[PDB]
Ligand binder design. Structure first.
Ligand SMILES: Nc1ncnc2c1ncn2[C@@H]1O[C@H](CSCC[C@H](N)C(=O)O)[C@@H](O)[C@H]1O
Ligand SMILES: N[C@@H](Cc1c[nH]c2ccccc12)C(=O)O
Length: 316
């Protein structure tokens, strides 16, 4: 009966996704499922690897531009699509508080655990603001986001790059319909650059990205009673020149037979068979403008870091 419980209210979606992904001829698993407690902690670690420049690069821009962004938006409500990295969130909240504008915070995530942490953290640090955690998939459940106040919706970390172009276009269009006049969108997009720098960012020496990738198998093992042997799958990251995107795979070292008991499903991996677990699309600055335009959104500002590694867009 409680609004807070409705908003914070997945298991069905994982079942559907795992069945479809593992029974396809080209096997795949969606990257939205990487970020359980263990995966989120590993992502955290990823944000501090020397190879993985995106987080600190976008953080650098936000540290410099948050006050400008807040000034331009005039928003009183921060909506974050995909939570879990509060260092960036705090920068925008601080600026909104500085401006005497901050009334409300709405974190949005597919993982209920991540929402609780962010809600608790921001709740303790920002007195006198309304907090509504919204649990959902940003490809399906944007409607669950309350339509209140003037909302600055932020979608950082190049998470938009984890959508392929058709789903990405549908996401932007649905996002645009959810925004009301006066609302603003802040979008982070990692940029095309040296291909070796790109591959290494998803294939670090410390082996952390590999553990992060293999952890999706642990999620499925736990949630659906499967028996993936994690060490039997090799992490592989590749650049796709045609699509200008990183592609992340798990490759079976030897033939594998996997029983997914909760789905009453048995699946086979040939030796050398690869399963797609993520893409990370890299953008050209002029194209972000075009993709936003297609969705009916008008980019009003573009910022980049001092090295030009990463892009941040403000639109209405
Ligand atoms: N399809 C989806 N719907 C809702 N949340 C998603 C999602 N796919 C990934 N996420 C969430 O988004 C986060 C991505 S990693 C952290 C992103 C953070 N905003 C940053 O910039 O660093 C995770 O918490 C993950 O659970
Ligand atoms: N949004 C992040 C997510 C990510 C970082 N490292 C990964 C490794 C595998 C899959 C996804 C990721 C990115 O594409 O940069």
């Amino acid at each position: 009966l409680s609004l807070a419980n409705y908003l914070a209210a997945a298991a069905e979606a994982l079942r559907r996704d795992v069945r479809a992904g593992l029974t396809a001829t080209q096997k795949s698993l969606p990257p939205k499922w990487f970020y359980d407690a263990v995966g989120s902690d590993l992502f955290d670690q990823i944000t501090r690897l020397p190879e993985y420049y995106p987080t600190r690069t976008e953080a650098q821009i936000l540290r410099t531009r948050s006050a400008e962004i807040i000034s331009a938006a005039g928003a009183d409500t921060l909506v974050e699509l995909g939570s879990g990295t509060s260092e960036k969130t705090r920068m925008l909240l601080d600026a909104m508080r500085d401006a005497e504008l901050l009334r409300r915070f709405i974190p949005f995530d597919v993982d209920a655990g991540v929402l609780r942490s962010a809600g608790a953290a921001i709740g303790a640090e920002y007195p006198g603001i309304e907090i509504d955690a919204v649990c959902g998939d940003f490809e399906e459940h944007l409607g669950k986001i309350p339509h209140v106040g003037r909302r600055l919706v932020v979608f950082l970390g190049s998470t938009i790059g984890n959508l392929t172009p058709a789903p990405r276009a549908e996401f932007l269009s649905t996002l645009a319909d959810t925004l009301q006049p006066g609302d603003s969108l802040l979008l982070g997009t990692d940029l095309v650059k040296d291909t070796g720098r790109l591959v290494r960012a998803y294939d670090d020496a410390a082996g952390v990205t590999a553990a992060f990738n293999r952890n999706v198998l642990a999620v499925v093992n736990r949630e659906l009673s499967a028996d993936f042997d994690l060490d039997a799958f090799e992490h592989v990251a590749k650049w796709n020149s045609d699509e200008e995107r990183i592609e992340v795979w798990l490759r079976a070292r030897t033939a594998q037979h996997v029983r997914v008991a909760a789905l009453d499903l048995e699946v086979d991996f040939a030796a050398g068979e690869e399963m797609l677990t993520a893409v990370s699309c890299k953008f050209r600055p002029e194209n972000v403008v075009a993709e936003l335009a297609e969705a009916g959104l008008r980019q009003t500002h573009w910022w980049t870091d001092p090295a030009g590694d990463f892009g941040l867009s403000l639109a209405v």
